Design a protein around this ligand. Structure first.
Ligand SMILES: Nc1ncnc2c1ncn2[C@@H]1O[C@H](COP(=O)(O)OP(=O)(O)O)[C@@H](O)[C@H]1O
Ligand SMILES: Nc1ncnc2c1ncn2[C@@H]1O[C@H](COP(=O)(O)OP(=O)(O)O)[C@@H](O)[C@H]1O
Ligand code: NA
Length: 214
């Protein structure tokens, strides 16, 4: 199974990606996680992203297409994969088309803009895994600790309110057009498309996605 998650920043995509990875046995491919890891490690492919992410802007198409091509070539993607944060522009989606990378589901997470800041400012992450929590809305079992490893959670450098506002503007200009892009693909029979209400509690969104993925 191959799945794309679409939605504004803070819509819940990374939260739900974890459940889909676990239940369907496919890896999550998160360009944000890969970029943050490349900055942290000083990796030649991606360390360049540091100041751009800090600005709330998208990284160039060529850099993330290369990160995704490298990641998806790996053995763990043989049986499918979930794309979380990619594609993020029409040229990224067209690069997938040109590579012959068909997908089975495109899942759009709908959340009103007015909920985004208060979600992201409360976000806490386990950087090695990508697991995400929220200090009020979805807290870890033990404060500041990853439920799975017990390691100390961190706060992303790009999650302050003003940076979130900039990322939401960028999303609306550059990334929202992918809704129509994939709706058109679905009408051609090349994927399924489904929209979920991302305002429901975490477990209810998970159940709605299970109804769709079968
Ligand atoms: N259904 C939900 N209700 C309330 N908060 C949520 C929900 N889903 C995720 N969150 C929290 O909102 C923040 C954003 O979610 P995240 O999954 O990181 O979004 P995305 O990957 O779409 O940017 C995180 O702190 C997360 O714990
Ligand atoms: N596919 C992509 N194309 C361009 N930039 C990206 C891409 N994926 C991630 N980024 C960069 O990483 C940042 C964080 O993205 P992400 O981790 O997906 O956060 P959020 O879930 O809050 O949108 C973006 O603001 C952008 O700088
Ligand atoms: Na398909």
């Amino acid at each position: 199974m191959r799945i794309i998650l679409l939605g504004a920043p803070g819509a819940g995509k990374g939260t739900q990606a974890q459940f889909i990875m676990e239940k369907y046995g496919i890896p999550q491919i998160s360009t944000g996680d890969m970029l943050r890891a490349a900055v942290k490690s000083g990796s030649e492919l991606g360390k360049q992203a540091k100041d751009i992410m800090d600005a709330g802007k998208l990284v160039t198409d060529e850099l993330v297409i290369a990160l995704v091509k490298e990641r998806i070539a790996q053995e763990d993607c043989r049986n499918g994969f979930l794309l979380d944060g990619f594609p993020r522009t029409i040229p990224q989606a067209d690069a997938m088309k040109e590579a012959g990378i068909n997908v089975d589901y495109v899942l759009e997470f709908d959340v009103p803009d007015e909920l985004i800041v208060d979600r992201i400012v409360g976000r806490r992450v386990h950087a090695p895994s990508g697991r995400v929590y929220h200090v009020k809305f979805n807290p870890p079992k033990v404060e500041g600790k990853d439920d799975v490893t017990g390691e100390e959670l961190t706060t992303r450098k790009d999650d302050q309110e003003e940076t979130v506002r900039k990322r939401l503007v960028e999303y609306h200009q550059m990334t929202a057009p992918l809704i129509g892009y994939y709706s058109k693909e679905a009408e051609a029979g090349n994927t399924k498309y489904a929209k979920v209400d991302g305002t429901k509690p975490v477990a209810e969104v998970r159940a709605d996605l299970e109804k769709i993925l079968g």
